Amino acid sequence: LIEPYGGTLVNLIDPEKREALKHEALSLPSLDLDWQQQCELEMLMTGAYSPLTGFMTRAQCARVESAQQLDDGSFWPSPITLTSRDRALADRRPGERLALRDGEGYMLAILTLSDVWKDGERWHLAGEVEGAALPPHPDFVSLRATPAELRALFVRRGWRRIIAWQARQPMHRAQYEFCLKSAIENEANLLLHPQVGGDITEAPAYFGLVRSFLAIRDRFPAATTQLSLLPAPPPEASGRALLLRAIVARNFGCSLLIAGGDPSVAERAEKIGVRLIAYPRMVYVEDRAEHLPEAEAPQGARLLTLSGEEFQRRMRAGLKIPEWYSFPEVLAELHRQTPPRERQGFTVFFTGLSGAGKSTLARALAARLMEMGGRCVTLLDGDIVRRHLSSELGFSKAHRDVNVRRIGFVASEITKNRGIAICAPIAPYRQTRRDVRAMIEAVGGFVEIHVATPIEYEVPETPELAIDTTGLAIDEAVQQILLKLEHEGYLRL
Amino acid sequence: NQLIEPYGGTLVNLIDPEKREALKHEALSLPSLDLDWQQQCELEMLMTGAYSPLTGFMTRAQCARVESAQQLDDGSFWPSPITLTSRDRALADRRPGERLALRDGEGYMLAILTLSDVWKDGERWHLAGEVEGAALPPHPDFVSLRATPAELRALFVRRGWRRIIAWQARQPMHRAQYEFCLKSAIENEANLLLHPQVGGDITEAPAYFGLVRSFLAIRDRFPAATTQLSLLPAPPPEASGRALLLRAIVARNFGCSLLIADPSVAERAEKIGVRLIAYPRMVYVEDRAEHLPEAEAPQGARLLTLSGEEFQRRMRAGLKIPEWYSFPEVLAELHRQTPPRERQGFTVFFTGLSGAGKSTLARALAARLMEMGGRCVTLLDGDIVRRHLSSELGFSKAHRDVNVRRIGFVASEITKNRGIAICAPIAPYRQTRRDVRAMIEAVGGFVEIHVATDPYEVPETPELAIDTTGLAIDEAVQQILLKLEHEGYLRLE
Amino acid sequence: KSAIENEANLLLHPQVGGDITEAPAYFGLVRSFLAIRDRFPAATTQLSLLPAPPPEASGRALLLRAIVARNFGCSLLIAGGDPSVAERAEKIGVRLIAYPRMVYVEDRAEHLPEAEAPQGARLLTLSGEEFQRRMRAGLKIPEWYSFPEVLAELHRQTPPRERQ
Helix, strand or coil: CCCCHHHCCCCCECHHHHHHHHHHHCCCCEEECCHHHHHHHHHHHHCCCCCCCEECCHHHHHHHHHHCECCCCCECCCCCCEEECCHHHCCCCCCCEEEEECCCCCEEEEEEEEEEEEECCEEEEEEEEEECCCCCCCCCCCCECCHHHHHHHHHHCCCCCEEEECCCCCCCHHHHHHHHHHHHHCCCEEEECCECCCCCCCCCCHHHHHHHHHHHHHHCCHHHEEECEECCCCCCCCHHHHHHHHHHHHHHCCCEEEECCCHHHHHHHHHHCCEEEECCCEEEECCCCEEEEHHHCCCCCCEECCCHHHHHHHHHHCCCCCCCCCCHHHHHHHHHHCCCHHHCCEEEEEEECCCCHHHHHHHHHHHHHHCCCCCCEEEECCHHHHHHHCCCCCCCHHHHHHHHHHHHHHHHHHHHCCCEEEECCCCCCHHHHHHHHHHHHCCCEEEEEEECCCCCCCCCCCCCEEECCCCCCHHHHHHHHHHHHHHHCCCCC | CCCCCCHHHCCCCCECHHHHHHHHHHHHCCCEEECCHHHHHHHHHHHHCCCCCCCEECCHHHHHHHHHHCECCCCCECCCCCCEEECCHHHCCCCCCCEEEEECCCCCEEEEEEEEEEEEECCEEEEEEEEEECCCCCCCCCCCCECCHHHHHHHHHHCCCCCEEEECCCCCCCHHHHHHHHHHHHHCCCEEEECCECCCCCCCCCCHHHHHHHHHHHHHHCCHHHEEECEECCCCCCCCCHHHHHHHHHHHHHCCCEEECCCCCHHHHHHHCCEEECCCCEEEEHHHCEEEEHHHCCCCCCEECCCHHHHHHHHCCCCCCCCCCCCHHHHHHHHHHCCCHHHCCEEEEEEECCCHHHHHHHHHHHHHHHCCCCCCEEEECCHHHHHHHHCCCCCCHHHHHHHHHHHHHHHHHHHHCCCEEEECCCCCCHHHHHHHHHHHHCCCEEEEEEECCCCCCCCCCCCEEECCCCCCHHHHHHHHHHHHHHHCCCCCC | CHHHHCCCCEEECCECCCCCCCCCCHHHHHHHHHHHHHHCCHHHEEECCECCCCCCCCHHHHHHHHHHHHHHCCCEEEECCCHHHHHHHHHHCCEEEECCCEEEECCCCEEEEHHHCCCCCCEECCCHHHHHHHHHHCCCCCCCCCCHHHHHHHHHHCCCHHHC
């Protein structure tokens, strides 16, 4: 079992000293970390970065970017540093002790300041760290191991040589099949170690990632495979990031690392004692009914592939996915997370002047869409919106802007949750619409309809539909927009 | 036989397109009444011939004379007062002779009423007089399925139909009603008209959509050459004999000579020319693999039934529904409309004093619930609610009590749409917390959790009351996952 | 329902004691629990093994199990398959609830303790002497008796004569 980097596993959390620090801190200045820094903190506090034992100092940081060493001259690929943009850090200085805490003022550790500087919008901090508590993680308690916890697990399991796969996205049949043979080929056990860092409201995407792993885990040999979470954001790809991950891989117990989705890095890496194998172009080889690395496929066999730009496409569109691409379970899960247009939520946003046949159109369009079922329709317009959402706003510039975003917000929740929301507020500023559209476009479908001809300030320069022509009965206009939705893909059988 | 002719002898039509432009013009210069959704139904029924010979709303004398001798001025038979109401103060100073513009809820003009009589009863105003129609209530939805008595009669005539049983459904049809219609039709050598009552508003009472959809779902189980589906624009009445006699009259005006629903009304009914057959207790007779009226079942055969109380219950709980009871399609459809608790939306509403523990619990509870997928979770608490819901709100008696409802509203939309909403605002008034609970309980699941660990007001009836004071977050969180698990709202693979 | 009724989490704690060659029957027991575990609420249920032979039934054995239940963390114990014992037990701080005659109540599509079933409802049962019989013989098992997974597992362990 490959022993920790530096030789011994760091642990910045001594319980004794713990009641200790909660104690000393009531009386200190405090920084509220953003979600990614708490990751970094947790990684450090927890030994993922052994031998490190505090955040690096501008000199140490600079010295990494050059010789890639610590003060020992020991090898270290990349700067571990604590940031923030709080304006309460501009008046702090070395020697001072800082309380570190979660976004909700929950106390994690005290930083003893080594160095303090700014570069760009944001502040950097340095110093030894003493930890009281780890970031609270109510979710996936079982699946979350510290490097120490995971190592212990490996030891009960009798494991020793271990390939790790530090996924940043869901796994289908090609990665699955390649992991399987990498593990047989290197006589290794397999650790599925998905990067999981996020927050319950700025970054809640990790939940789906975890769920897509839970979905296919049973496809894996039980005696040979382990699933655990790696609390960190995925890094950006660089030889440098890669070498760090190798290090945290080592600190977790793994002596092999898969990387994929040059001579130097291989070079250093197989130094720090972790062999990293690369992920090749996998092709489905129909003549053999299995995926192979492209270069191992037999001559003139027909090879079969499916791009992501294409997978994603078929998924949005309800198209057929080949049986050899992924498993039914994963597919079913990816569809519970991100539905086909056919089945996803969307808001219909009417814009124009108080030739507010807007309202009349909106009501009629509601009625029609209600014939469908499957998705619930809400009309955000008259009584409803006064009564509940802007019970009393003025007619100020910003008051109306706020309204408008108010409605874009409630709309976004309706659509995030797979409903259809229909809105026709007064909105004259391209910008404020642009924000509403982005808000809801993130979480589902947005269809702007610009009413110009008065179906019987700033022009939308890019609607989905512009009811253009002059004599147009409600019926004809309504139809015209059911035509858009039908063509845009949102309606259903 | 033949096609039963209209009651009174000839089919009323209060809409002369020849006088249509003149009416839309005259109206502009008139006082106007905006009708509620049910009066527009009454108007549409009258305007359209469903109540032939009637040709205007009855007058206090005529109304009184119906409740007595059940006659018109002719002395012809008429079961029940047809009358137009409004709860509009602007009606108190209006008088016979005046002409009134009748309009839908959005000021769309329908007809002018020439006032015969104007009087008040309790909370509402009654109106009387001949009616001249311009337009019918706008109905974007189910255009195909909506026929006027004249349109329907014309249809019947192309279909070559003569003798017709009508079923004026007010609720979905399962195998018993279906099987009994089939035999009533064979037994009376009649064609069958499924005529579900459909009156509501896109918001006021958008329940009819489900009703129609449940009919569309099972229509294919019906013989094509013998069955017709059409909508009957009206609210279901409240069960009476005059009322039942009215429905018989509108059944007659639509073309039907038989009505399923006495029997001294089957007395007056047979009289105006429409035979009304009664719906018996249907039982599933295993010994015959078919439903029979209870009194026709063989003796000592095992009879099988399923109350609505019990159907409902099984549906809300995920329990098995017999196969003789319904059809897969209808079941599937009733489940898309009203899901099992397992799968339906619900808000978790934390209440207590400040009540930072409230917020902490709420966030933890959100994280846990997010492990589950299927339903999306939204935390309506901190930044979120400020930013978009209440950025601008005093601390008034009525500005905190608007903030709360504000959040009950957004929450209701989340849950209506099958999501879970988690809220922990400051709310000290029972009453306001009751209104919120009713608002969301209408559309889904509401679970109050009273965190007990101006002047506050301890909840008198929470679902869960966390008392014990030495509680860790984890223990409390669990304690509420218990409440939810036991209340039925949780599910898993 | 015991767990909802007592506002309690649930611990499935099968007795597992044996040897790999004189007593290898516990493997199947464990496997029949693994088979149906997913039918249980995850946030509310735990499966763990209790290394011991099952005892022989006696008020005395029962009180011991209550004790080991307590030592494991459990404050409630189900017993089933008198006033004294209840008496002592609820002393040592562990409430033991008894396992009643469960009947399948077709009028309600669910099992109820016999005494809670509605009047004149048809009740449905299946003895073990009868289950075991149908299993040896390839006969039909009612859908309301057990789950497909468990059945499938019991058949991988002990096949019909047809197949043994």
